[PDB]
């Protein structure tokens, strides 16, 4: 795995020692090359994971996530170039180093073989994210949002740390391979119930769960564009990966313990999409959409069936790409008009047609138009839920309808109608912005052709 | 105070602690504590203020009561065993009295009330000596008598110390008081593992000492005793406030910073002894410490508070005095986590 | 100098001689105090510090040349003369910056006296700066809160330093001072009101002179008498102020003072007290921009001796 | 309440100074080279080449191998009259029931 890790580390000295003019260029070139290197990991043996060394291993679950992270860094750099132009060279380098440290921590999380190392780096990801939000946010609420995000995640994680140490003391190892191979069943006891809660709750906080999702809207609305990109694309999927890995230990008790979280997610997706129908802030709308999709993923994980897991992985990747692109599209309009209110900017299709096309494609993927990987994941989750219970289809279909409604409603309000007369600062979309939207879209449409890459290990 | 006299007083403090950590006879250990107090009191009053005198008086009264209780416990253990050696204590009442005395010396709650006041009264340098060096001797004594310690009393004091250290800090806008409450919480963390594994207490003490040394030296370099005076620092020495933010994050215990390893190892040892509820509560209660650390960071570095026009004058000048060990202390306080397995050296 | 130097046996008392004598020549605007101060310094062989101005620090740091007003001072005395009651708060900014400059000058002066044993002749001082503030407050140029902030800063800072041994006040009547200002011909200075000068004189005579007379003796001279510099020098040489702080001070107090004055930042530590007065509070964006501009100044990016731009060499081994 | 600089006007459009801005920076040269770097190393290199690399990635998933083994087993079991798929994953004899 060091083929990816060490160049990522070397990105930091290169960024620090590069000339003030060339920081973005050098970062982008080498991050794209690192992603090209990371593309090799997609080749996974069907029976067994790629165990590179004692510390690091990769499977068909970790590889798409690593590729997503490595692809996401250059996109974040392109998006964050514009609003950081006025910043001094040291501050821009510090921002880039926070991004690089975040990518490094995420790669090591997805590849770590030991649950305690996974926890250490998965909690380490908070520090760069918190610094980004609280230092380069543009509103006074960034401090409150950072506090909420940090404290929600830590309150979830600390019991996970205690439980992981207890597992190390009892079973004797936290290596995922050994745990999977030994994996003695749990018993229905209050001690085991609370171990299950401790293991599950940290990831349930990371994957915005209804009632634990309050941090996500504040964080995504208040963060800068790059921070929103990582939060939507990878930081939420950290919870999904953790839950999928950790579900091996808690085999039987999952059936009893899933019902609260299952019902919470199943109702919360409807509630959050209904919230999306009435949101007045574009970033907030996208955030609640992310909450709904992640609730679907939570349902898929809790069901613990092969089709559910495949759909969960597909939805994770597809949603990461779609949400990152949607945040980028919203950020462009925010830079142009300096407000996030949906109603303020109207009829932008006449002013910016290619951006309107990007918005159309992004919304179509968001509403899971086939054969998008979004729909592949969602449909697999729906079929798994139907096997779990035929009555799930009512809630799943209602959620799909509302997702279509709010996606096309955002598209209609922002990009259709009469142009706002008084706004005169709209200017032709830069090649950077269109390039960013294309870099988001083209991989997503391409992955439809070969879907086995993002269908996970159980494929 | 003449610098030769100041050096003699500091060497007397250090010699008292060395006698505490070196002697196998209880009378000499108590003598070392007495020397520590005698030498410490004028050091706390190097700069003569009414607050300095008040802090010295409070500290003297508290340490004098602690020493008297300690000597009574020693005398009772002598009465029931006839042994002067620091070893298993053969009378439970003497054990309880000695535990209370040593906790009062350490500032463990509910004997914590003097720590914030004394720290606020004395200067930043005296505060550094008080919150780093003075902790060594009582912790050494407790480690030597760990087996005799009744786990319930020590654990209750540790949990109360963590709770009170977390609570008090939230309400404080004075940097010295914040540091004192953080010290109380970390002392609770250290004394939590004392019944189980003393090496963990030593490791936590070393990490805490490095972090507090770094924080106090940064405060001295910035010459700030209040949150706003520290907020003004970004305009003058941005590197200082950036390093302060990193050290604060370490003190909160956030991974992958070095502040995480003492909490991690303490939780490990407690779980090995089937303690699950206690580590969970301690870890959750650390979030209050983390909160006021984060608020200080917001005030200092992450957010740019308004400066004053006269700061343009200070821009031209440079800091005259250099604290040599500050960079290494920062590095150890922040980036030593990849090197925990070396916790077998002090073992 | 350091604790080590004191341990090595460096004693300030031994170095201090009769020459050591902080002499402050004070007076109203255009009172001729500079001429007499210069003459006294020449005749008595004492260092002469010109009256502290907006860019006193600029002279004592770096190249020495004055910096831009935005970078250093952010205040204009000409603006004060033209627009005393400006909403910009330039009046109190100017007064506070002048007080800080005089604090730095007094520290530098004391450092010279302790390091060399040579007396220092100062044109006004921190102890006399309150006169201008009182005059502004009486005329309504500054608010009461500005006066309270100035009092806080003075109370915290000035107590540390030792007051001058000899105070020389050159007294010139206010109408003759107005005549002198007209003769000098400075356009901004001409706008000074008579009431402002009268309040300066009132503050001086009513407060500064008695308060200094309590500590030591004050030599008050008229304009004609001040012109006879040799007579003033003789009077100073025949002064005997046994009462006062300087006889009480010993080597310990001198060591503490020597240390304080050496650390200029420690001297100016409380001039930046976090009291958020509108006049002197600088917003975050403006503060950041001005700090960046100061950093971009030649020879200011790094610590002195490490700025390659201004010709420093051997940095890799320095 | 404070002396603060006036809020800067909306950041000057890069189009004004250089009409062919491309964005990515103020100076046109770095603009052009940043866009060339982005376009080349993303679209030309990563997207195209990596898409081919994934498309022709070796079937280490053993899909074709699984199909060939299934074909052999089906042919053999149909030829010998054995049932196509045995109901027991593991041989009953090796298992020792309680």
């Amino acid at each position: 795995m060091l083929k990816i890790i060490i160049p990522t580390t070397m990105l930091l000295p290169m960024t620090w020692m590069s000339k003030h003019n060339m920081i973005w260029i050098n970062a982008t070139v080498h991050s794209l090359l690192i992603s090209l290197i990371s593309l090799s990991l997609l080749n996974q043996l069907g029976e067994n994971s790629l165990n590179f060394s004692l510390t690091f291993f990769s499977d068909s679950l970790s590889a798409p996530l690593l590729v997503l992270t490595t692809w996401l860094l250059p996109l974040m750099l392109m998006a964050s170039q514009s609003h950081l132009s006025k910043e001094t060279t040291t501050r821009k380098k510090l921002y880039i180093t926070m991004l690089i440290l975040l990518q490094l921590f995420l790669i090591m999380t997805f590849t770590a073989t030991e649950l305690i190392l996974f926890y250490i780096l998965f909690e380490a990801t908070l520090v760069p994210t918190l610094i980004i939000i609280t230092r380069w946010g543009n509103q006074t609420e960034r401090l409150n949002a950072g506090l909420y995000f940090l404290f929600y995640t830590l309150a979830g994680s600390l019991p996970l740390l205690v439980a992981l140490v207890y597992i190390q003391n009892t079973t004797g190892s936290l290596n995922f391979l050994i745990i999977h191979y030994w994996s003695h069943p749990l018993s229905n006891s209050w001690s085991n119930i609370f171990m299950w809660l401790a293991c599950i709750m940290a990831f349930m906080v990371k994957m915005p769960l209804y009632g634990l999702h309050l941090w996500l809207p504040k964080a995504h609305v208040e963060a800068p564009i790059a921070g929103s990109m990582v939060l939507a694309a990878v930081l939420l999927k950290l919870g999904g990966y953790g839950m999928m890995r950790i579900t091996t230990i808690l085999n039987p008790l999952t059936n009893y313990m899933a019902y609260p979280f299952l019902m919470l997610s199943m109702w919360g997706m409807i509630m959050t999409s209904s919230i999306c129908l009435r949101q007045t802030d574009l970033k907030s709308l996208i955030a609640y959409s992310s909450v709904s999709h992640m609730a679907l993923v939570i349902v898929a994980i809790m069901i613990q069936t092969p089709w559910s897991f495949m759909g969960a992985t597909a939805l994770m990747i597809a949603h990461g790409l779609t949400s990152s692109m949607l945040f980028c599209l919203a950020n462009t309009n925010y830079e142009r008009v300096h407000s996030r209110t949906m109603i303020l900017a109207r009829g932008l299709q006449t002013l910016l047609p290619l951006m309107a096309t990007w918005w159309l494609m992004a919304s179509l993927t968001n509403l899971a138009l086939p054969p998008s990987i979004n729909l592949i994941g969602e449909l697999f989750i729906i079929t798994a839920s139907f096997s779990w219970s035929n009555i799930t289809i009512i809630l799943m279909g209602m959620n799909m309808m509302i997702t279509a409604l709010y996606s096309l409603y955002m598209l209609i309000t922002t990009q259709r109608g009469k142009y706002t007369h008084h706004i005169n600062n709209i200017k032709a979309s830069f090649t950077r912005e269109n390039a960013l939207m294309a870099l988001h879209i083209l991989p997503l449409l391409l992955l439809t052709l070969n879907p086995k890459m993002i269908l996970g290990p159980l494929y | 105070m003449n610098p030769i006299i100041y050096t003699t007083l500091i060497m007397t403090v250090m010699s008292g602690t060395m006698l505490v950590m070196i002697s196998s006879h209880w009378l000499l250990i108590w003598i070392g504590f007495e020397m520590n107090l005698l030498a410490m009191i004028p050091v706390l009053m190097k700069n003569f203020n009414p607050r300095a005198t008040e802090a010295a008086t409070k500290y003297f009264l508290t340490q004098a009561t602690a020493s008297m209780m300690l000597m009574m416990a020693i005398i009772i253990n002598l009465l029931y065993s006839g042994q002067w050696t620091i070893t298993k204590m053969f009378n439970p009442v003497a054990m309880t009295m000695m535990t209370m005395a040593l906790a009062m010396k350490l500032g463990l709650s509910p004997f914590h009330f003097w720590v914030p006041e004394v720290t606020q009264g004395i200067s930043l340098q005296a505060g550094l000596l008080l919150l780093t060096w003075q902790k060594l001797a009582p912790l050494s004594v407790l480690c030597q008598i760990s087996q005799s310690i009744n786990p319930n009393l020590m654990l209750t004091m540790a949990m109360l110390s963590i709770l009170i250290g977390g609570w008090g800090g939230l309400n404080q806008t004075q940097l010295r008081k914040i540091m004192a409450y953080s010290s109380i919480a970390h002392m609770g963390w250290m004394t939590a593992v004392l019944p189980y594994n003393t090496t963990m207490t030593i490791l936590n003490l070393l990490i805490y000492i490095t972090m507090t040394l770094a924080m106090f030296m940064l405060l001295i370099h910035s010459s700030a005793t209040t949150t706003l005076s520290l907020s003004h620092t970004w305009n003058k020495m941005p590197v200082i406030t950036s390093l302060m933010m990193v050290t604060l994050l370490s003190m909160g215990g956030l991974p992958p910073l070095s502040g995480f390893m003492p909490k991690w190892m303490i939780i490990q040892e407690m779980t090995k002894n089937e303690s699950i509820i206690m580590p969970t509560l301690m870890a959750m209660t650390a979030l209050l410490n983390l909160y006021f650390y984060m608020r200080l960071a917001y005030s200092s570095s992450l957010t740019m508070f308004p400066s004053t026009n006269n700061m343009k004058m200070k821009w031209q000048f440079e800091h005259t005095k250099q604290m040599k060990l500050l960079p290494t202390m920062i590095v150890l306080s922040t980036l030593v986590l990849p090197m925990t397995p070396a916790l077998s050296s002090l073992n | 100098y350091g604790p080590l130097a004191f341990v090595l046996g460096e004693r300030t008392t031994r170095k201090l001689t009769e020459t050591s004598k902080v002499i402050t020549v004070d007076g109203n605007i255009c009172s001729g105090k500079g001429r007499l101060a210069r003459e006294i310094a020449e005749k008595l062989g004492l260092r002469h510090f010109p009256e502290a101005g907006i860019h006193y620090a600029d002279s004592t740091t770096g190249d020495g040349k004055p910096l831009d007003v935005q970078l250093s001072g952010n205040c204009s005395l000409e603006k004060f003369y033209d627009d005393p009651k400006s909403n910009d708060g330039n009046s109190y900014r100017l007064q506070s910056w002048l007080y800080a400059s005089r604090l730095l000058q007094y520290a530098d002066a004391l450092e010279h006296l302790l390091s060399t044993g040579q007396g220092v002749v100062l044109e006004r001082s921190i102890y006399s700066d309150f006169v201008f503030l009182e005059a502004m407050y009486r005329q309504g140029f500054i608010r009461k809160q500005c006066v309270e902030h100035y009092n806080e800063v003075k109370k915290v800072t000035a107590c540390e330093y030792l007051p001058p041994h000899v105070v020389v006040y050159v007294d010139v009547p206010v109408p003759e001072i107005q005549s002198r200002i007209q003769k000098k011909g400075n356009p901004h200075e001409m706008k000074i009101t008579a009431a402002y000068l009268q309040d300066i004189e009132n503050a001086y005579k009513k407060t500064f002179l008695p308060e200094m007379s309590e500590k030591c003796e004050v030599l008050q001279y008229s304009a004609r008498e001040a012109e006879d510099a040799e007579k003033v020098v003789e009077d100073i040489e025949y002064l005997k102020c046994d009462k006062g702080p300087w006889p009480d001070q010993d080597d310990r107090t001198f060591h503490r003072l020597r240390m304080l004055v050496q650390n200029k930042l420690e001297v100016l530590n409380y001039t930046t007290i976090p009291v958020y007065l509108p006049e002197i509070t600088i917003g975050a964006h403006q503060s950041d921009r001005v700090f960046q501009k100061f950093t971009e100044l030649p020879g200011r990016k790094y610590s002195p001796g490490y700025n390659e731009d201004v010709g420093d060499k051997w940095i890799w081994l320095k | 309440i404070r002396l603060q600089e006036d809020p800067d006007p909306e950041d000057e459009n890069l189009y004004e100074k250089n009409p062919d801005s491309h964005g990515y920076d103020k100076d046109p040269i770095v603009d052009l080279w940043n866009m060339r770097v982005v376009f080349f190393f993303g679209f030309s290199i990563v997207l195209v080449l990596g898409s081919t690399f994934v498309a022709y990635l070796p079937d280490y998933r053993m899909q074709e191998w699984a199909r060939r083994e299934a074909e052999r087993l089906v042919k053999y079991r149909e030829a010998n009259g054995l049932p196509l798929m045995e109901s027991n994953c593991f041989d009953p004899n090796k298992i020792q029931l309680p």
Partner: peptide, 14 residues
């Protein structure tokens, strides 16, 4: 516009 920074009121709050 520009990133919000603490004003006199916010600073005085602490």
């Amino acid at each position: 516009a520009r990133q919000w920074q603490p004003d006199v009121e916010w600073a005085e709050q602490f």
